[PDB]
Amino acid sequence: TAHRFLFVSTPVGPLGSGRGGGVELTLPNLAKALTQRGHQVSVLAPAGSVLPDLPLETVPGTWQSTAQSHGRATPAEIPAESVLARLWDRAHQQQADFDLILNFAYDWLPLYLTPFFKTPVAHLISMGSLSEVMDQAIATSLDRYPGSIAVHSLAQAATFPFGDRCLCIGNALDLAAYGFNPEPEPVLGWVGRIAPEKGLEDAIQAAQQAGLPLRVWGALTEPDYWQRLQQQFGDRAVSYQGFVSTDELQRGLGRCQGLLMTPKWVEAFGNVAIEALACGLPVIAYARGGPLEIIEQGKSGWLVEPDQQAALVNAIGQLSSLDRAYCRAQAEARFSLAAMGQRLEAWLLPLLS
Amino acid sequence: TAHRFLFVSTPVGPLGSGRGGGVELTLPNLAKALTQRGHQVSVLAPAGSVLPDLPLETVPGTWQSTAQSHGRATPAEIPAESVLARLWDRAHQQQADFDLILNFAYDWLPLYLTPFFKTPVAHLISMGSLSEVMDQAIATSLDRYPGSIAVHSLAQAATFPFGDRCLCIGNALDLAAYGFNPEPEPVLGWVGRIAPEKGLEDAIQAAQQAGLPLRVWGALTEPDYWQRLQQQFGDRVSYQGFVSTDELQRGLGRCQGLLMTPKWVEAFGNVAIEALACGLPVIAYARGGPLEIIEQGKSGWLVEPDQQAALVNAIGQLSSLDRAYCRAQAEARFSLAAMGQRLEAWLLPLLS
Numbered sequence: 001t002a003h004r005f006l007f008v009s010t011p012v013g014p015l016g017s018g019r020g021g022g023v024e025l026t027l028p029n030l031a032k033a034l035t036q037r038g039h040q041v042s043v044l045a046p047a048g049s050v051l052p053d054l055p056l057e058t059v060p061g062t063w064q065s066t067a068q069s070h071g072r073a074t075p076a077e078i079p080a081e082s083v084l085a086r087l088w089d090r091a092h093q094q095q096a097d098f099d100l101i102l103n104f105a106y107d108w109l110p111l112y113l114t115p116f117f118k119t120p121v122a123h124l125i126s127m128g129s130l131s132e133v134m135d136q137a138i139a140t141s142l143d144r145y146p147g148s149i150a151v152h153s154l155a156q157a158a159t160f161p162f163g164d165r166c167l168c169i170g171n172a173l174d175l176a177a178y179g180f181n182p183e184p185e186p187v188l189g190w191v192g193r194i195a196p197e198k199g200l201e202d203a204i205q206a207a208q209q210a211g212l213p214l215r216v217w218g219a220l221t222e223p224d225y226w227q228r229l230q231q232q233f234g235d236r237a238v239s240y241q242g243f244v245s246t247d248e249l250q251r252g253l254g255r256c257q258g259l260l261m262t263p264k265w266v267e268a269f270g271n272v273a274i275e276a277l278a279c280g281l282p283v284i285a286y287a288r289g290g291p292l293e294i295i296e297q298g299k300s301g302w303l304v305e306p307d308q309q310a311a312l313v314n315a316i317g318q319l320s321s322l323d324r325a326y327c328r329a330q331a332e333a334r335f336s337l338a339a340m341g342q343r344l345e346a347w348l349l350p351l352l353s
Numbered sequence: 354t355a356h357r358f359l360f361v362s363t364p365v366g367p368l369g370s371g372r373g374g375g376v377e378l379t380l381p382n383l384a385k386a387l388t389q390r391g392h393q394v395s396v397l398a399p400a401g402s403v404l405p406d407l408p409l410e411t412v413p414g415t416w417q418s419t420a421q422s423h424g425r426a427t428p429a430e431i432p433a434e435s436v437l438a439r440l441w442d443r444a445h446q447q448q449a450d451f452d453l454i455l456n457f458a459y460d461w462l463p464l465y466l467t468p469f470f471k472t473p474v475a476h477l478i479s480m481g482s483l484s485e486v487m488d489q490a491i492a493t494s495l496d497r498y499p500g501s502i503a504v505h506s507l508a509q510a511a512t513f514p515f516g517d518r519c520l521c522i523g524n525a526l527d528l529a530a531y532g533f534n535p536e537p538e539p540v541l542g543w544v545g546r547i548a549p550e551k552g553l554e555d556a557i558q559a560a561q562q563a564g565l566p567l568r569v570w571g572a573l574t575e576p577d578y579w580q581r582l583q584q585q586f587g588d589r590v591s592y593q594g595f596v597s598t599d600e601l602q603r604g605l606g607r608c609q610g611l612l613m614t615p616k617w618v619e620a621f622g623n624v625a626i627e628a629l630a631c632g633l634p635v636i637a638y639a640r641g642g643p644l645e646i647i648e649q650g651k652s653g654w655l656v657e658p659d660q661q662a663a664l665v666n667a668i669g670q671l672s673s674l675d676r677a678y679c680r681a682q683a684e685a686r687f688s689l690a691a692m693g694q695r696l697e698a699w700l701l702p703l704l705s
């Protein structure tokens with residue numbers, strides 16, 4: 001049952017550098033999810049990539065732009081020195097060393113190339129139906145290779161006309177790196193860019209009105225914003241906890257009574273919610289996007305109406321009705337590498353040969 | 354030792370539409386050159402294409418663009434329903450029915466796909482250097498597959514930094530389709546895609562100054578671009594349409610000479626040799642591909658670029674050139690049987 005996989009990373013940026021999007025966090029966990037079952041995983045990724053403990057080969061070139069120029073009719077683009085093209089030309093040279101190649105990129109090229117490979121190629125789609133050129137490439141790959149496409153959510157699968165023929169593998173997190181904290185301080189947390197248009201003001205005003213300091217984790221780009229926040233809400237409002245590593249983020253976040261999540265719909269990913277549950281921290285989130293699949297209403301968090309102070313404050317007031325051990329228990333059951341590995345095997349192993 | 358070849362056309366539009374330029378004449382002629390030596394040739398092209406005599410397979414979808422966009426920094430582009438992507442998908446599915454695939458398109462994708470094929474893929478490049486993305490794709494294919502890249506002229510080769518590593522196969526025509534005409538009307542000809550920055554203006558001015566009507570053939574693009582020619586110059590310049598080879602050669606044969614007045618590069622090969630095959634000397638700016646086709650003062654005039662007095666002087670000396678000589682040079686240099694030898698010398702060694 002042990003096999004050899006090659007993972008081909010996203011062209012959007014390096015692993016380990018803060019700017020491959022969500023694929024940057026998922027690729028290493030999925031690799032671990034298989035290496036922990038005895039499989040070999042090697043990784044191909046852009047120059048500058050860092051990844052502990054796995055064979056890693058890096059490839060030079062220009063990062064794929066997130067662009068989206070003319071909406072749904074945007075064509076696929078290949079610039080000179082495309083890192084995406086060179087990743088796939090390199091994967092093709094070495095294809096006979098692997099039983100299967102797993103693509104993490106959301107792009108036309110790898111889907112198109114799939115029949116030109118003798119080794120089977122599977123695709124983990126991380127968005128979002130976004131363009132005709134992409135929707136048609138995935139549909140065609142599905143017709144020739146049933147079972148070759150997976151998604152992380154049903155919501156994302158439903159944005160595609162062929163969504164029922166994609167497999168859902170869910171989300172995973174390296175739970176070993178997250179300590180359960182059953183005894184928090186009377187503080188709330190918020191995770192994200194300390195910048196305008198992130199819903200930070202909504203979190204601050206609801207924490208303060210609820211009577212609890214807000215700790216924040218993330219990147220400060222404009223110090224004048226920090227000052228504006230102080231002038232709006234005073235200097236006991238928000239406490240800067242750092243940009244800060246995974247291990248640092250988890251002991252910090254774990255001491256919170258709850259995590260507030262107030263992002264715009266286009267930034268409403270579920271990743272940080274999982275990290276919160278893993279520390280035993282319940283989540284109060286706007287009831288749209290990624291959190292709707294992570295949080296169990298009245299049990300592991302509260303899903304509230306967007307942009308309404310009273311809904312945040314009513315939720316914060318009811319954090320004590322949620323059991324922190326149940327949050328952790330849900331993370332162990334739903335989002336572990338163990339759970340993920342089994343879902344990967346179910347998906348991939350029928351594709352071998 | 355007969356062989357099976359698959360020719361893949363340009364994705365810029367159907368064969369017969371005029372949208373693909375000289376490639377629409379080159380690909381059927383080269384197919385004919387090989388089939389005359391006993392080989393089998395099949396063609397794959399966009400939906401709407403026509404090809405007398407040969408197996409053709411067509412594929413629907415959206416046409417590739419001219420690719421002039423931006424300048425050298427234009428990325429390669431693959432739209433939804435890309436005819437280019439579907440052509441190469443179809444070539445791949447049938448690669449085992451052929452000994453070699455010959456690509457005629459000036460595009461990243463076929464170059465990129467070459468190592469993904471088991472059947473060998475050669476490339477006949479019809480343009481000079483235009484982009485970073487294409488320059489690099491060609492170089493990389495040359496690096497891995499020496500001898501797999503061909504051009505039509507040494508001048509076109511010299512626009513690339515790796516030009517000395519390309520094989521030049523020149524130009525040829527189906528000579529039996531072109532009638533020699535020894536008795537021209539007092540008119541001048543111009544043949545090409547009708548469009549800005551193609552030199553049409555210079556040609557019109559020079560003909561009018563020399564007091565000879567200009568007859569113009571070619572695929573158009575917006576009739577506004579036409580109008581203003583009759584009220585900056587006047588005349589009927591006389592537009593003859595976009596026509597078949599048989600129509601073009603009978604029209605062009607009536608001309609005293611052909612004007613080629615490109616602003617840039619190019620304008621490499623096909624129309625100058627067609628004019629010669631009819632017996633019509635060529636007056637061209639001395640830049641680009643014309644230098645290698647025309648024999649100065651015998652089959653044409655090669656004059657200082659961008660000088661109207663030069664063209665008018667040349668128009669003035671058309672009489673002294675021998676029309677039979679132009680035709681004899683077409684026969685000696687631009688024949689299909691010779692192209693047939695050159696193509697085999699290029700392609701046969703790329704097999705197994």
Ligand SMILES: O=c1ccn([C@@H]2O[C@H](COP(=O)(O)OP(=O)(O)O)[C@@H](O)[C@H]2O)c(=O)[nH]1
Binds near residue numbers: 377378624
């Ligand atoms: O009425 C016409 C005018 C032109 N042509 C053909 O158009 C091509 C020349 O195209 P162009 O000058 O656009 O050459 P390009 O620069 O596109 O290769 C030649 O092969 C001609 O045989 C034609 O068939 N009928």
